[PDB]
């Protein structure tokens, strides 16, 4: 049926190495500080646009002392980013606003280029620091080595992006794996032309609308069309080349 898989860790490290051209090089989440979904939701609700981000239609659509200009100390301007970040402080009327994740602590993970080094190694990127016992007892795990060949790779998979970070899972539909979704969820690289820059904004827009509008699936009485067809004597079944079947589809439609 091909429904569940479970792999060993050398398999996952080989696949992770072979897939790296399509994968991100981020280890933590802080890159998406005001570029996450919740920031985009808040931004949409307030009718404000993060500079790389999508733009929508507005959701909401007298003389006074409180708003007076003689009383204002204009020290720095209030940017739009601040209003996304602390929405209840800088907005009168925040409706349908989402609070964003504040901070996650920095993953200080150290990549190893060369496999001949030990797994536990003081990398030069790290800043330098600066009664009797019985004869039977030993340290725990005295036989086992400290590291093996698999250790640096196994540590490397802890900080990998999904689905690499797992050992087992369900097989997924081929179409349901976009493979580029991460490229547009990051900032557009610098120096790109206007059409490409705009392109990034449109792809993010559709990403934000699918995430907003989603409601969980309604549990309905499924029906199977092809099983009903195969239950009849009028439909027979076989195994054909894809091109052969494709030609038949073309001929039959004509």
């Amino acid at each position: 049926t091909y429904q569940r898989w479970q792999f060993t860790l050398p398999m996952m490290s080989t696949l992770y190495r072979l897939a790296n051209q399509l994968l991100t090089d981020l280890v933590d989440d802080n890159y998406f500080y005001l570029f996450d979904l919740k920031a985009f939701f808040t931004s949409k609700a307030l009718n404000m646009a993060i500079p790389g981000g999508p733009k929508f239609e507005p959701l909401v659509r007298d003389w006074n002392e409180f708003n007076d200009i003689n009383k204002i100390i204009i020290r720095q301007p209030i940017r739009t980013e601040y209003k996304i970040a602390f929405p209840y402080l800088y907005n009168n009327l925040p409706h349908h606003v989402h609070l964003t994740w504040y901070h996650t602590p920095n993953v200080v993970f150290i990549k190893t280029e060369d496999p001949d080094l030990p797994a536990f190694y003081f990398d030069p990127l790290i800043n330098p620091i600066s009664f009797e016992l019985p004869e039977f007892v030993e340290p725990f795990l005295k036989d086992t080595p400290l590291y093996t060949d698999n250790t640096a790779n196994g540590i490397a998979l802890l900080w990998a992006p999904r689905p690499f970070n797992l050992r087992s899972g369900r097989t997924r539909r081929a179409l349901d794996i976009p493979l580029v979704k991460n490229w547009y969820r990051e900032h557009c690289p610098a120096g790109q032309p206007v059409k490409v820059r705009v392109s990034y904004q449109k792809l993010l827009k559709y990403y934000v609308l699918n995430a907003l509008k989603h409601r969980p699936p309604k549990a309905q009485k499924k029906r199977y069309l092809f099983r009903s067809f195969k239950a009849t004597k009028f439909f027979q079944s076989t195994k054909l080349d894809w091109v052969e079947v494709g030609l038949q589809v073309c001929r039959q439609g004509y």
Partner: peptide, 26 residues
């Protein structure tokens, strides 16, 4: 609408809505 400047929607304006800063400020 970034920094309180611009059209909330460029739609029906007749234009693309591109906004740049004034370069001749003193």
């Amino acid at each position: 609408m970034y920094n309180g400047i611009g059209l909330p929607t460029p739609r029906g304006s007749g234009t693309n809505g591109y906004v740049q800063r004034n370069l001749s400020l003193v």
